[PDB]
Design a protein around this ligand. Structure first.
Ligand SMILES: CC(=O)N1CC[C@@H](C(=O)O)C1
Length: 113
């Protein structure tokens, strides 16, 4: 029961808050490229990759029709990083801050929707 443009306007500020965390968004702004990074094991562990640029493109092109599909992609992003990376790593620690930021902000948006 959502217009494509009202859903986008509602959820976009939540994505921007993730993207604007500096430095914590930096490992998440682009899809992981195992070839470029030289980590051939990546897609053996992460079957369904996700990142902030992919989420933005989906929010911009009507690929979310209910709020929970957007929320699922954000958690797929967090959970991929928490599965592949060491708990002490920059990526894991940065993921944990992005999740805090998401949690602290997503509740009213989902209430208003
Ligand atoms: C966000 C994430 O899970 N990543 C795994 C490898 C790390 C990197 O090496 O860039 C990025």
């Amino acid at each position: 029961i959502f217009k494509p443009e009202e859903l986008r306007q509602a959820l976009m500020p939540t994505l921007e808050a993730l993207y604007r965390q500096d430095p914590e968004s930096l490992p998440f702004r682009q899809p992981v490229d195992p070839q470029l990074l030289g980590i051939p094991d990546y897609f053996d562990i992460v079957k369904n990759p996700m990142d902030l640029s992919t989420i933005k493109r989906k929010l911009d092109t009507g690929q979310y029709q209910e709020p929970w599909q957007y929320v699922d992609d954000v958690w797929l992003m967090f959970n991929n990083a928490w599965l592949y990376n060491r708990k002490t790593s920059r990526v894991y620690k940065f993921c944990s801050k992005l999740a805090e930021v998401f949690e602290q902000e997503i509740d009213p948006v989902m209430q208003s929707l």
